[PDB]
Write a protein that binds this ligand. Structure first.
Ligand code: HEM
Ligand SMILES: NCc1ccccc1
Length: 292
């Protein structure tokens, strides 16, 4: 059995990690022009998810622990196209705090982004330890977007995620946009795409979606308001179990925030054993909370 035990970066405590959080958050505030003024928040969230989403619950391969996205096999994964922008953003942060592990930095990037975009607090635990190049998972473990609800359900079960967790996690698609050159899909999902809200669910239910081909010859669902949904997004209103949960989050952002926060922490922690002596999860203050 392959076990990854969280090991606190030697001599570091909450306050050290809050400094890393603050550095990420200050750079997010500064680099506001990225991606036609969306900023780096969305791509940092996606990065944190993609480095975690290689996990296989069956044998504990992949996952966030080893920081293996730093190795070319994984950063050149076609599924990861575009995330190099997030990695470059993080580079000066890692230079300022060389003591932090790669897995901790990439996951913390995602937590910082959600919180600074006015999303829920996400508790975060340190202790991921870099592992060598030969532990890098092969490409092909991240999901396709052209598929239906059955595929989504099956895919997420490899990450030990159930229906509620799947629907909550997908609400992160409120953020950012699809880019044709990265994924073969093009367009934003709504108007509020650098503030964390339940817009994904509202738009799914309330927009008039038309199935169209895009300029890469892939099918996607497009609205007259200039928004789109991936086939896997749209599957959440096709499957009856998913649809019920989509309605719940559309009606109650607070519930969405609570369930997202739990699911996102779990996603970022899959594969990691936290010893009983480990620090409690950290809840970082926002820059606003600190007057910074
Ligand atoms: C069935 C599962 C999923 C599929 C098929 C999927 C697919 C995609 C695709 C195709 C893109 C566009 C990438 C690009 O063109 O730049 C995207 C973007 C994004 N994904 Fe997902 N995704 C899934 C789940 C998730 C999850 C679980 C999260 C995080 C909790 C997430 C967060 C994001 C974010 C924040 C973006 C915007 C990135 C940006 O604007 O640069 N996705 N996703
Ligand atoms: N619903 C369109 C979408 C998908 C992924 C990321 C942003 C927006």
């Amino acid at each position: 059995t392959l076990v990854h035990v969280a090991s606190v970066e030697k001599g570091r405590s909450y306050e050290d990690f809050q400094k890393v959080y603050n550095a990420i958050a200050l750079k997010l505030r500064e680099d506001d022009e990225y991606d036609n003024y969306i900023g780096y928040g969305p791509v940092l969230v996606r990065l944190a998810w993609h480095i975690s989403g290689t996990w296989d619950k069956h044998d504990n391969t992949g996952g966030s622990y080893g920081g293996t996205y730093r190795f070319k096999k994984e950063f050149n994964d076609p599924s990861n196209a575009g995330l190099q922008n997030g990695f470059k953003f993080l580079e000066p942060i890692h230079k300022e705090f060389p003591w932090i592990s790669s897995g901790d930095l990439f996951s913390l990037g995602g937590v910082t982004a959600v919180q600074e975009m006015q999303g829920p607090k996400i508790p975060w635990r340190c202790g991921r330890v870099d592992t060598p190049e030969d532990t890098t998972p092969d490409n092909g473990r991240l999901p396709d977007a052209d598929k239906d609800a059955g595929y989504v359900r099956t895919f997420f079960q490899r990450l030990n995620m159930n229906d509620r967790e799947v629907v909550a996690l997908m609400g992160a698609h409120a953020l950012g946009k699809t880019h044709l050159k990265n994924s073969g899909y093009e367009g934003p999902g709504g108007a509020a795409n650098n503030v964390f809200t339940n817009e994904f669910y509202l738009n799914l239910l309330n927009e008039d979606w038309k199935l169209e081909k895009n300029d890469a010859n892939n099918e996607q669902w497009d609205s007259k308001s200039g928004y789109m949904m991936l086939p896997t997004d749209y599957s959440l209103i096709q499957d009856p179990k998913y649809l019920s949960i989509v309605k719940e989050y559309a009606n109650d952002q607070d519930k969405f925030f609570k369930d997202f926060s739990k699911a996102f922490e779990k996603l970022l922690e899959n594969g990691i054993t936290f010893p009983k002596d480990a620090p409690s999860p950290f809840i970082f203050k926002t820059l606003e909370e600190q007057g910074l």
